Amino acid sequence: EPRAYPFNDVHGLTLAGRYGELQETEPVSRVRPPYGEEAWLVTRYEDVRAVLGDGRFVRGPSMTRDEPRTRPEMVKGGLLSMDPPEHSRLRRLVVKAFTARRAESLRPRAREIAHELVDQMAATGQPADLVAMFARQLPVRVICELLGVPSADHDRFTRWSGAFLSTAEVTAEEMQEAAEQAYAYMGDLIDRRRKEPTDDLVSALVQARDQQDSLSEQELLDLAIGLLVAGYESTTTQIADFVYLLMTRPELRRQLLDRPELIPSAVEELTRWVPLGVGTAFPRYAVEDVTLRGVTIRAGEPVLASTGAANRDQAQFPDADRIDVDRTPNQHLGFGHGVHHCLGAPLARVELQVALEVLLQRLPGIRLGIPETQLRWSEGMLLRGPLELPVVW
């Protein structure tokens, strides 16, 4: 009876056509992913705005059941390991200090990284790899800038987080360094912020409270490794997908070269197109019974939400599986809904905007150095993108 999930696959890039056809020809499925119990899988805009938007669907039971997912280990760390009110106490806090203004006040250093990453490319000669020489190297530097970390240790962090990244190639002898020294260095820096507050993100996170609650050393060390390793994974891979789209679409590479003022509308339309790697948000449980499309959801039963496919619903968007960058204003679902969203987007807006901007400011002659399919791919089993991306100018 159940169907085998994922319907997307680690070797691909768009929303898999059998996924976008079962969103029309079976609009809610029973699924077995590769790890966890059986689940329902929800596909349509107003069904996923519905199941990630009523207070009897929640994450909290995932903490005592083996949860329906695409990878072997359980969700143990960071806010998606957590449930209300205990999640609300954490999210009310991180939204006061992970601000959209501070994201804005990073764009001058993220461009100054970015222009320097194209100056060192230029000085290295061609072909170059644009993931190793750009999409891997823009987050970790901005993200260490955002924490107020000295430049001379951004080298370690690349190599540190890189030995935990699926989008990078460092050995377990560096995980052996990273596990020994990196949590200790952020502790060393968290202790600095307790000692003396400063304009950095860690400082705001020792000063900000939810009502009068304090984010403790372990809580701020946890968030921060997840930012500098998970969020890093996320924006490296999202950038290498996107700038591999700029390498392979020549009419848009000339369109943005022609109209840099259109770049935020293309980022927003590329954002409304995001199939969210595997196609779904992690599993929520109905804590009491609830009917949906004439079939009963049971007390204590898991629903997956296909948010990346529901960002591509033909009955929400025109030709919804494709892009049209002439669409504006725009709105989107490939990041979750109501209290069930990703944290990152105010940062990843500045990355996604800078990362198209200053490439076409600084070396717009750039293109893909190969026959256009002949790359090596990122297979970590939540997100999809290239591992290497050759380029010539």
Provide the minimum distance between the beta carbon of 364 and ligand HEM in the complex, in angstroms, as a whole number.
24
Where residue 149 falls (left for φ over 0; alpha for ψ -120 to 50; beta otherwise) is beta
What are 280's two structure tokens? 């779904």
- Closest residue by beta carbon to ligand HEM: 344
Measured distance CA(151)–CA(241) in Å, rounded? 27
The answer to whether residue 380 forms part of the interface with ligand MIV (CB under 6 A) is: yes
Measured distance CA(140)–CA(144) in Å, rounded? 6
Q: Sign (positive/negative) of CA torsion 346, 350, 351, 353?
A: positive
Contact 363, 125 (CB under 8 A): no
Provide the minimum distance between the beta carbon of 45 and ligand HEM in the complex, in angstroms, as a whole number.
17
| 154 is an annotated ligand-binding site residue | no
Is 274 or 358 the residue whose CB approaches ligand HEM more closely? 274
Phi, psi of 286 (to 5 degrees): -75, 120
| 284 is an annotated ligand-binding site residue | yes
Provide the minimum distance between the beta carbon of 369 and ligand HEM in the complex, in angstroms, as a whole number.
25
Q: Which does 381 bind (CB under 5 to 8 A by kind): ligand MIV, ligand HEM, none?
A: ligand MIV
Query: Cα–Cα–Cα angle for 230, 233, 239, nearest 5°?
Result: 140
Element (H, E) at 186: helix 172-195
Q: Near ligand MIV by CB under 6 A, which window of 21-29, 96-104, 122-130, 223-231? A: 223-231
Whole-angstrom Cα Rg for the chain: 21
Q: Near ligand MIV by CB under 6 A, which window of 49-57, 115-123, 133-141, 228-236? A: 228-236
Per the document, the length of the chain is 393
The answer to whether residue 11 forms part of the interface with ligand MIV (CB under 6 A) is: no
What are 391's two structure tokens? 């380029």
Provide the minimum distance between the beta carbon of 65 and ligand HEM in the complex, in angstroms, as a whole number.
16
Binding site for ligand HEM (CB under 6 A): 78-80, 91, 227, 231, 234-235, 238, 276, 281-282, 336, 340, 342-344, 347-348
Question: Which of 135, 229, 247, 286 is in the footprint of ligand MIV by CB under 6 A?
Answer: 229
Closest CA to 203 of 193, 195, 191, 212: 193
The answer to whether residue 239 forms part of the interface with ligand MIV (CB under 6 A) is: no
User: Which residue positions form the known binding site for heme?
Assistant: 87, 91, 284, 340, 342
Write out the residues near ligand MIV by the rule CB under 6 A. 73, 75-78, 80, 164, 166, 225-226, 229-230, 233-234, 380-383
